[PDB]
From TrEMBL, chain A:
Family assignment from sequence similarity: Belongs to the picornaviruses polyprotein family.
Function: Protease 2A: Cysteine protease that cleaves viral polyprotein and specific host proteins. Protein 2B: Plays an essential role in the virus replication cycle by acting as a viroporin. Creates a pore in the host reticulum endoplasmic and as a consequence releases Ca2+ in the cytoplasm of infected cell. In turn, high levels of cytoplasmic calcium may trigger membrane trafficking and transport of viral ER-associated proteins to viroplasms, sites of viral genome replication.
Coiled coil: none
Transmembrane segments: none
The protein's assembly and partners: Capsid protein VP1: Interacts with capsid protein VP0, and capsid protein VP3 to form heterotrimeric protomers. Five protomers subsequently associate to form pentamers which serve as building blocks for the capsid. Interacts with capsid protein VP2, capsid protein VP3 and capsid protein VP4 following cleavage of capsid protein VP0. Interacts with Viral protein genome-linked and with protein 3CD.
Species this chain originates from: Echovirus E18
Subcellular location: Host cytoplasmic vesicle membrane; Host nucleus; Virion
First and last residues shown, out of full length: 611 to 843 of 2189
Name of the featured protein: Genome polyprotein
Highest taxon of source: Viruses
Amino acid sequence: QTRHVVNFHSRSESTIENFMGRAACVFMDQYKINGEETSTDRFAVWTINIREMAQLRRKCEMFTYMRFDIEMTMVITSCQMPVLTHQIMYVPPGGPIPAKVDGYEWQTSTNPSVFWTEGNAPPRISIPFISVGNAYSSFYDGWSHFTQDGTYGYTTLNAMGKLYIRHVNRSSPHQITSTIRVYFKPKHIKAWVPRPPRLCPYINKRDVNFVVTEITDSRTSITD
Amino acid sequence: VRSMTLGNSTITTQNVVVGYGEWPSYLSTAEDQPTQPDVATCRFYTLESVQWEKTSPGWWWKFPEALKNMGLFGQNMHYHYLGRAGYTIHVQCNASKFHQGCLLVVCVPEAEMGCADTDTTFPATELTTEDTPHVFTSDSITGKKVQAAVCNAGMGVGVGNLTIFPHQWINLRTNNSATIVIPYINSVPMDNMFRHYNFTLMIIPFAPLNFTDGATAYVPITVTIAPMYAEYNGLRLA
Amino acid sequence: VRSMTLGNSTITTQNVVVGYGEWPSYLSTAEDQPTQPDVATCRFYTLESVQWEKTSPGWWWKFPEALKNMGLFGQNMHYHYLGRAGYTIHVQCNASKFHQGCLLVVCVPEAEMGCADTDTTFPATELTTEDTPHVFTSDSITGKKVQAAVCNAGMGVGVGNLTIFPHQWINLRTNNSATIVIPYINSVPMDNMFRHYNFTLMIIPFAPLNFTDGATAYVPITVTIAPMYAEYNGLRLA
Amino acid sequence: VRSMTLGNSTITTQNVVVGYGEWPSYLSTAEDQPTQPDVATCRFYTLESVQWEKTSPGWWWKFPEALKNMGLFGQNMHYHYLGRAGYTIHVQCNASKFHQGCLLVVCVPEAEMGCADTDTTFPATELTTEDTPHVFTSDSITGKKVQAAVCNAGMGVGVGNLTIFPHQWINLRTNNSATIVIPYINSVPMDNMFRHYNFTLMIIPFAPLNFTDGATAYVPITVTIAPMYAEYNGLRLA
Amino acid sequence: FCGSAMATGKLLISYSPPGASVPTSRKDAMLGTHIVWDIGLQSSCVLCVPWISQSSAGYITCWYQTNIVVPPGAPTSCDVLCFASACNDFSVRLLRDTPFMA
């Protein structure tokens, strides 16, 4: 490459909606169709949170507070029959969860769910700003239980819900193993209180713990 | 030289960094009604002076509960379970003319700090010791406590670019005093003052203190907090 | 007869082909600020005269760096890494009345030339020898150098329909002088003057020179370039 | 504190002694025509800092040719054989508060200096070493060089009554900076810049430097020259 | 400059254009672009470096014009902090993923 005259004047790509509002795959998972009537491998879960993969988590940690609608579109495949129909049930933060693929919770009227049959365009489900407070908090320097009990750094305001996914087909002659790819996307996003970027690598998906990392890459002397 | 007074507390001062360009203010409903103390609360609460030697790596205080034993504010924390305030923070250094050094006085809202040895948590008495500050460390440490190594202050960020927050430099060459006004940054209008630490006043020496063999071996840093526009929940019936 | 002068360089001339109907001009920001030399730079830089015999197939010069050793222009190429200019190019032939011939004086922006034996490249000193011109050849050649056969000048096109570019015919029957103005054709407002060759002045004899046994065995072609509206980057702070 | 800038050279300054009450100016004929560079030339040329100890007797620079290797001024000396300039000379000392001393910063036009052992001359490299200063001496010296003993600076006059020229005292008790403007004193409007030394900036410590066993053993004197209103002869025809 | 209030000296902050070579000496840095920053007068000198883009850059060297002059009471060795931001306005176009995260 060579250093060219990069002559233009634009910051429309540096706005918050043009920086955060990009769809990224945040959840791959497998789920069967038949066998093991009492099993946990016939449906998916994925509790919705921004701390899924480090690349997007890093961007969410530029800002302390942010509020945004989410508009996820699933991309569902299958391996190994009839034409298959799926169900992607979003439960709100206050909502019952299934324990099995044949639980009664799947029929709850307050849990919205899409019934996507195979071959069509991917299913798209949009979720508004659910949180109790006025913004989602990326960081919470506080304790969930009063008087400095356990569970540091976890507030219940930045709870977004869960996403239970199953086949609606009761059975099949052979085994069908479906794969789902949830494409998370912030929408109509506002952000408050900027924050320095992450320096150290991430350890765990529910905490801010880190190993002490060097500031920058080292050089030989101060003058070279 | 301006001799500020609030209530029954007068300090002697020598430009204000208004945090995020807003001055604190009250929340303005009969279903939930706030109580505005105004009386007391707003006086100056001078913490214990902190000696800054050549080998001091830094300090941090976690508010609002750093004032949990400070008079009527510290006592209204126990009778009301919701509140909010503004906290004007003066930081003098009263060094000499032959001392040299530089401080970063930054407030860092929502400073979620990390444990020293990850895969576990810390016993909640490692973040805060009310009035007294937890110091940083010069290198990495282990044990069930806060990873207090500078260059990764508390949050896993670079300590140099910690200037994005409401800050003020105290260069002993030029100035000695800092003052920051933090207009209650939070996602809910009121929150409990013992669970949640709204911000973390951390003072970090970038350029280390230096002097010769005749001066005093330290420079005492004086911290003074004035809770402004503190309001609480209502205790009366409607 | 018009005696043009620019700076401390005067030539004697005898219609101008303005390249692409535009006259060169300046670029008109505090983030990037150009410097306009104006002083010098604009004077006439007369290259070495080129003898045109009966068997001469042609010549080419690659600008802007054909002037890389030509005074202050050639020296500002080394201190500024960005620039642009206009290059008024006079081409006299000062033949006699009994000589006959015809030249194509064309400028050809972005003349990417091809290697003589393909599957390889040429050692970068075959495109240009600063002031002196690389001649074409009458037939095909081999080796790690430019395929300089006329009928396929440099680019693999027909040499007859090379008239699409800013051109001028020098028919010794009628005229002797040519002048072309090339208003800096490029896709970026400024570019480095050593990496990129903005255009390629190539003079190609269509009708060959002819004369009898008494005349001089050659006709010297004189090339003169005046860099107009040269501007560079800024070296000062902002 | 005023941050002066000229061209691409900015210095930081802290009253001007205009030499002989005149500010330099241009000479204002087609038989002889001057060229005014203006561009560059006028920027600040900071010489090498000079350490002033307790035993330093003094220094001298001989201009205009002290700037003979200083950028475009130093290069226009070689292409034009006639010229004139004004030379604003800043002299800082940036000592401490506990250092004491006093300097005479004087310019002395036409300082014809005498040989050390009379009946002979000196080899022309003893008056000047371009950028670096020739020091004086505390007593008499011999050999084919300049009689550089203070009390008889260079010319055989008393060094105390050297105050008749454009001068400025630098008393470290009060001030640290000096600035002198010397409006080209000469008997001919233009003269060659290598034969003739128009003036001799000599800095002479009257009261010697003194300090205690803790301070730095020297005080660096910084000299900065800005050639103003430099104009040269013409190189073009008429 | 995070030194004493009594330390006094001069530093010469030179800037090389993105094509030019670095100054090997202090004089060669003085003949280019520079700012003789007197520490005893002001303690904070601000630059503004243009022509910064990518899609072979400049240099900010610093030189001892004079040494640090210090009274007997104040310490001899000092420190200088540096800062960086966008000078007036900054242009930026094509979003990508950061290299730092793995």
